[PDB]
Amino acid sequence: MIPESFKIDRSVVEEFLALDPDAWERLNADYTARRRIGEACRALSRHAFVEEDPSALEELHDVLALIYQQDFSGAPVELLGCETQPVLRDIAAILEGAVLAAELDSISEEQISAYPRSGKEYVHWLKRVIGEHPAAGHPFYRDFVPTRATEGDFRFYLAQETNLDPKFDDILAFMQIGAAPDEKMEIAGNYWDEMGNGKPAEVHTAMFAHALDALDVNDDYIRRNLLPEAKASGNLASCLAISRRHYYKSVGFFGVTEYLVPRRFKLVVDRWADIGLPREGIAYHDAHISIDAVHASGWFKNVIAPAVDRDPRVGREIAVGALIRLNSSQRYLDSLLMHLHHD
């Protein structure tokens, strides 16, 4: 299969996904080919995060995005017999470990150690910590959107947001696997809300797609305009949700998400109305402004506080996940605003 040391990129992984079931079985039996895949991933990781080559960084997130696509998407009939896990999980573990190591390089021990070791108190501490971060009040939402954002700006912004919102329901489904009762209940009700409480017209992914349609945020536009930090943001969300061991990070990552949505979406929706854009986008953001004040409150009170009270050691992991969401959001919004300013 792989008779030499090679370079790995998205096209290489696409070739893998075109293999037939017997070819996959032969690849899985060849630990020499698999060692070469792993060594190639470690080389890509060095280029991306040690050398910080922007081309390698985007290539690494393109690779991870392709794998998470397999983890999150309904499998196609042609791929049903293909055992992709031995190779794809090795690639993902290597590139994920590099992505997470780089996030942690921006997180100091002093930020994640002085938390109160009980639940209600921890929530006050975390909200304060979130409020210290600039991503909690980023000028893209506070200044650019109310004063300048055009339809073309919103189209480009929505293209970036496809990294996350279209898979919120399955992120929650992954997160709640094996969760303790109080935490599981709260995540379950959040998921049921994402599922429109049983009404197909109120399913959040369906409503989000209508906002995309309203501005012709089509698949090809998305592919051409997705920023590297949008890809990283989407890959972080997937990485944390699909491993049990990242659950507490995930609790902080999506806790920040729920907490911040109402103020951000209120600014988007007011400007959207001000410039006469269609009502479909009003619908998706309108829902969340009210819904996510309740989701955020429930998340702090019924996921974060019980987990800390059960084992306060997890307060460190939750704070790490919160800071990862904030840092990655900041890089995403700064990159977004920089690109929007240029136009």
By CB under 8 A, name the binding residues for a second copy. 28-29, 31-32, 34-35, 38, 70-75, 77, 79-86, 89-90, 92-93, 97, 170, 173-174, 176-181, 184-185, 188-189, 191-192, 195, 198, 200, 203, 206, 243-248, 311, 313-314, 317
- What does 295 bind: Fe ion, a second copy, none (CB cut-off 5 to 8 Å by kind)? Fe ion
Tell me the closest approach of the beta carbon of residue 250 to Fe ion, in angstroms. 14
Cα angle 123-243-61, degrees, rounded to a multiple of 5: 100
Nearer of residues 203 and 222 to a second copy, judged by Cβ: 203
Length of the chain: 343
Q: Is 229 in the site for Fe ion (CB under 5 A)?
A: no
Question: Is the sign of the CA dihedral 244, 247, 248, 249 positive or negative?
Answer: positive
Calpha distance 60→68 (Å, rounded): 12
Rounded to whole angstroms, how far apart are CA atoms 203 and 166?
11
Residue tagged 């794809």 (tokens): 88
Q: Which of 258, 282, 289 is closest to 190 using CA atoms?
A: 258
Query: Both tokens of residue 179?
Result: 């969760």
Cβ-based nearer residue to a second copy, 50 or 180: 180
Residue 149 to residue 153: CA distance in whole angstroms: 6
Decide: is 295 part of the binding site for Fe ion (CB under 5 A): yes
- Closest separation between CB of residue 296 and Fe ion, Å? 8
* Nearer CB in complex with a second copy: 69/290: 69
What mask, x for binding Fe ion by CB under 5 A, covers residues 193 to 212? -----------x--------
Tokens of 57: 């960084």
Q: Is the CB of 201 or the CB of 224 nearer to a second copy? A: 201
| Min separation Cβ 193 and Fe ion, Å | 7
Name the nearest CA neighbour of 227 among 160, 327, 164.
160
Nearest residue (CB) to a second copy, 29 versus 275: 29
Of 248, 292, 323, 325, the one binding Fe ion (CB under 5 A) is 292
Distances (CA, A) of 71 to 27, 65, 89: 20, 10, 10
Q: Is 25 within 8 Å of 83 (Cβ atoms)? A: yes
The tokens for 24 are: 């996959």
* Residue 150, binding choice from a second copy, Fe ion, none, Cβ under 5 to 8 Å by partner class: none
Q: Where on the chain is the footprint of Fe ion (CB under 5 A)?
A: 204, 292, 295
